[PDB]
Amino acid sequence: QANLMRLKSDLFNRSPMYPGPTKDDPLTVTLGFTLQDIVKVDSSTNEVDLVYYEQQRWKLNSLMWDPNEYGNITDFRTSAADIWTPDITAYSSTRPVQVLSPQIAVVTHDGSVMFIPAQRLSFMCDPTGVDSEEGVTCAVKFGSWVYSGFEIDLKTDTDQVDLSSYYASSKYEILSATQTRQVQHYSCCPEPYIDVNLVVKFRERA
Amino acid sequence: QANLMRLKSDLFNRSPMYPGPTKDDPLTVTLGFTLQDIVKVDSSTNEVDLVYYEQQRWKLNSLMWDPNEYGNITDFRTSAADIWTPDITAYSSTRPVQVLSPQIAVVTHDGSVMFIPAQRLSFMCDPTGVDSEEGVTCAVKFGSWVYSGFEIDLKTDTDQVDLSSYYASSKYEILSATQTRQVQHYSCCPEPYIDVNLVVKFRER
Amino acid sequence: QANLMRLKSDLFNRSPMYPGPTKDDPLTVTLGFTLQDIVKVDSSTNEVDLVYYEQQRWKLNSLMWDPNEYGNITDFRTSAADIWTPDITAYSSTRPVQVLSPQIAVVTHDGSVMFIPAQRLSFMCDPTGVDSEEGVTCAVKFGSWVYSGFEIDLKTDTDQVDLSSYYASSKYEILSATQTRQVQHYSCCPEPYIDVNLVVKFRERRGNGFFR
Amino acid sequence: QANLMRLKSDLFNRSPMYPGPTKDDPLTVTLGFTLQDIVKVDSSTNEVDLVYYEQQRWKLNSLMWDPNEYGNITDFRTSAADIWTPDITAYSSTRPVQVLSPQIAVVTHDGSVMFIPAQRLSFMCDPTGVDSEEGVTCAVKFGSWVYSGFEIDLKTDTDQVDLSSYYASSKYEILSATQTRQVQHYSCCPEPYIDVNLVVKFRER
Amino acid sequence: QANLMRLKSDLFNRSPMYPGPTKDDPLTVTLGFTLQDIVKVDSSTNEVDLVYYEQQRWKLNSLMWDPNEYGNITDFRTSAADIWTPDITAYSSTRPVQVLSPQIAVVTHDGSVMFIPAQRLSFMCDPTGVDSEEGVTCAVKFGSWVYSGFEIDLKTDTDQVDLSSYYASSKYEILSATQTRQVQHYSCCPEPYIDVNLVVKFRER
Ligand SMILES: O=c1c(CCCO)ccc2n1C[C@@H]1CNC[C@H]2C1
Ligand SMILES: O=c1c(CCCO)ccc2n1C[C@@H]1CNC[C@H]2C1
Ligand SMILES: O=c1c(CCCO)ccc2n1C[C@@H]1CNC[C@H]2C1
Ligand SMILES: O=c1c(CCCO)ccc2n1C[C@@H]1CNC[C@H]2C1
Ligand SMILES: O=c1c(CCCO)ccc2n1C[C@@H]1CNC[C@H]2C1
Ligand SMILES: *[C@@H]1O[C@H](CO)[C@@H](O)[C@H](O)[C@H]1NC(C)=O
Ligand SMILES: *[C@@H]1O[C@H](CO)[C@@H](O)[C@H](O)[C@H]1NC(C)=O
Ligand SMILES: *[C@@H]1O[C@H](CO)[C@@H](O)[C@H](O)[C@H]1NC(C)=O
Ligand SMILES: *[C@@H]1O[C@H](CO)[C@@H](O)[C@H](O)[C@H]1NC(C)=O
Ligand SMILES: *[C@@H]1O[C@H](CO)[C@@H](O)[C@H](O)[C@H]1NC(C)=O
Ligand SMILES: [Cl-]
Ligand SMILES: [Cl-]
Ligand SMILES: [Cl-]
Ligand SMILES: [Cl-]
Ligand SMILES: [Cl-]
Ligand SMILES: [K+]
Ligand SMILES: [K+]
Ligand SMILES: [K+]
Ligand SMILES: [K+]
Ligand SMILES: [K+]
């Protein structure tokens, strides 16, 4: 339909691509996790596999429009190929992340974007003692691979992972799941890098 | 042949692609499953593997033509890359879906589209008790990932999964298989999201 | 080289791609199999894995040329991406087919095409009794996914599968294999769909006689 | 640098791509193998897994230049996607080959090309007896899938496989490894087809 | 923002891509490793799996700009597809490397490029004795697949692998990890090829 075709043409065809954030124009990405399943533990390799979806939110002045000019359209669905998306990376993955959901984001007229990729992740986690009453704690950091806190900052709306869609017949019960903003430094670079640390305490369903 | 080449040029090389449904111009997708096989059960991970094909049907005013202007062509086969397709997603998959069929749809002159992809799906399912008389029940929801009920509604033509092509020598016998429209809500969003819940009761043959 | 570059530029750069067959302009695809190996049997899942090459042949008026206009060229090899190819699909695959050969077809001046992909297929097959003297029978149907018999018909040149290149040290001995045209109907659609049904009779290789 | 940019633009932006060899303009591909490892044996499926790199060499008049016109450049590295490469295929693979090296070739001013892809290959091989003093012999043929001997000929520079980079702590030791040109006919086609037969005799270390 | 969009347009849209190094304009790539985990050992195939990130650094005159003409911009992030990147390859891999990080480099106004890909590598390594106090030593060379020492030289900033991010609960403890420049010759070619030899001594925790 005609107004949406005109809006996407104006935002995407009639302009150069956003080159990502800079020290002079930084952005904040909001992250939140919905943990669906601890699928698998490998005690020979200390790898654990999670299925989750990761809510990402950011805002660009370059994606703003006036709904009055575009038939009162206030938001639209678009291919994530059409827009810049942040390079949010699991810092202790052992396999490439597997994508479980369509690469489609929602853009709102204030320039705000929400993108909610479902992923299967293999990460470094020692499951020794998962068969006990006290279980095991594992953690994985999610943040930009290449932008410091001077270009990409992160936040969470809450410290509590959403467990409302956790698989009730998983082999693993969740005892706690937190998502916490964290600062790290790396050998290569003096600047602080920001991540959200996902910390999960679990045990066999003891 | 010449009439079909003209039709495809007129439909695909003139307009921009359909930008998907909206609140002002919503779409109903019809979904149905043909279950071919329960291929694998993993009791160490509670993952079960299905092979099926999923019939999808929708209709766009933008895909209409007058057959009289195109040598009485009433439908054509086309690459699914040429057309918008709905983002129908399994909500509890544990692996990316494996595509088993050519990505080709049929478009009809009234603007109706049918697309029937074959898939192998791993999903969240506890098979504890599959070796018993009563067997086990597992369920997986299929719906738009990104469009609410205000842009994509769903329906089935029947609540009975088609079992007329179920593999006769499968390790697993199907006791029942249903496909039912449901409403769900998610933390992110106040709007209702529509799914078709595929519910399968099965046991070792 | 100059004459072939001219022919491919003329055939491929001047007109839209062939939009595939229609009820008005149907085509017949010839299929035949050369079975190279039964690689694997999965008795936990009733999956069996075949390696074969599949000879496909069809003919398009739009691929015709006069060899006298193109330095007496009578045929050429080309990327299978450059031409229409039939959507021949295994109906009981459990995994995406794996391609083992280059995607290159031969086009002949009469508009005939031959394309011989090598594939590894996992399909639905119960191997219970494969370790017996009699072995097991499995079958898989190959046909268009999307075109009825009104757009794509199939045939074989012979109902006998080519077993003369079967791997002599396979885990599995091939007893016989047939490739037979068949008509099917599906729930979605009233039109007949055509397949070639590949039937394989095999058993575990053990000096063991074949008697019936 | 300026002279190489000019050479690449002159070779690759001006003409249509080379349409491959013909009966009127045939080519010879030289092949040789460097065997790095027998990585795995599967006695349940009679599949063996090799890691090797394959030296391929051929010559096209269409890739010639005069070094004097391009700053005395006599050769250059280029993406294998920029040039025609031969469709050399293992005849008894059981899996798609896995590429282990960058897709980059070296073109020389006489029009000669050298391309040395590293591959992991699963092929048809019964390893029964590998744990014995005499070991086991397996073979795999490499050749064009689609070109006869009238369009592509093959040769070797030596019948000895290069074992100078064989992994010294492999599970398997090599007793012999040879590479031998052969000719045969196929049911589909009237002309002779060329292959190079890789024959490896090995045992447990 | 505007100054960065202008700089990228000037660097990438106005000239051909850099055609890689030559004997007349060679380059030096700095390499270093950050070892995150020895993930897996396969005693049946003598394959070991590493997770690491590899810091790569080089400098091109063609990537230089004056920050004064671009709003004081001194560096920028860019897709690795936008620029030339060196063909650094593990010489004893047994499977294609799996990429674990975004393909995004940083270009600085002096033309220097830093690119830090994270990878999972399967390579040739006999783990026999890893359960002992003395453990085992494995080695893998990293270098250009196609460029000799006349086009690509390598250096390290240190011969000590960075173990500051090694997984504290790995099955394997690192006893030592070194990264050392070395010269190799190959059968095909008389010229020296340069690699960085990654030597890791490890044992069961
Ligand atoms: O890849 C980059 C870049 C971009 C290239 C160098 O400027 C910056 C910083 C870092 N990396 C990779 C590692 C993970 N993230 C933090 C740190 C180490
Ligand atoms: O990805 C989206 C979008 C688009 C991005 C946000 O507006 C909407 C709604 C939802 N998701 C992802 C999850 C699954 N489906 C329902 C719900 C939660
Ligand atoms: O995908 C299609 C199409 C095209 C889409 C609907 O017109 C037709 C017919 C069928 N399919 C898929 C299944 C397998 N092949 C036969 C039958 C059922
Ligand atoms: O695919 C072709 C072609 C091209 C198509 C027919 O002209 C020629 C010859 C052959 N094949 C495939 C098989 C393997 N290689 C030799 C022989 C049989
Ligand atoms: O692929 C090439 C090239 C380019 C093609 C021949 O000029 C040069 C040299 C080598 N190779 C591959 C092997 C590994 N690296 C060193 C040596 C052997
Ligand atoms: C947009 O909003 C104004 C004010 O309510 C209304 O007059 C106009 O017709 C609307 N157009 C739409 C929804 O197409
Ligand atoms: C199309 O339909 C009309 C109406 O019956 C028919 O008479 C006409 O010949 C047809 N035209 C074609 C096939 O081009
Ligand atoms: C085509 O046909 C005849 C040989 O019968 C020959 O005289 C003519 O030169 C041929 N053309 C080419 C380019 O070979
Ligand atoms: C090419 O060759 C001669 C030396 O024989 C020399 O004069 C000339 O400068 C060389 N280099 C270039 C870049 O032309
Ligand atoms: C660039 O730097 C100079 C000197 O510090 C300053 O005066 C100028 O306004 C700066 N421009 C920017 C940040 O755009
Ligand atoms: Cl954007
Ligand atoms: Cl469309
Ligand atoms: Cl065609
Ligand atoms: Cl070429
Ligand atoms: Cl560059
Ligand atoms: K993007
Ligand atoms: K589509
Ligand atoms: K094709
Ligand atoms: K090529
Ligand atoms: K690159």
Author numbering:
A (entry chain CCC): 20 to 224, 226
B (entry chain EEE), D (entry chain DDD), E (entry chain AAA): 20 to 224
C (entry chain BBB): 20 to 225, 227 to 232
Paper lines:
Cytisine, which is structurally related to nicotine, is a potent agonist at neuronal nAChRs but differs in displaying only partial agonist activity at α4β2 nAChRs, the high-affinity nicotine subtype. In this study, we sought to compare the binding parameters and structural interactions of cytisine and ligand 4 using acetylcholine-binding protein (AChBP).
The monoclinic crystal has two pentameric assemblies in the asymmetric unit. Electron density for the ligand is well defined in all ten binding sites and they refined with average B factors less than or close to the values noted for their associated subunits. The Tyr110 OH group and the carbonyl backbone of Trp164 accept hydrogen bonds from the secondary amine of the ligand, indicating the presence of a protonated group. The hydroxyl residue on 4 is directed out of the binding site, forming hydrogen bonds to two well ordered water molecules, which in turn interact with other waters and glycerol. In the AcAChBP–4 complex we note that the 3-hydroxylpropyl substituent appears to force the Met133 side chain to adopt different rotamers and thus avoid steric clash. There is only a minor perturbation of the protein structure at the side chain of Met133, where a steric clash is likely to contribute to the reduced affinity of 4 compared with the parent compound.
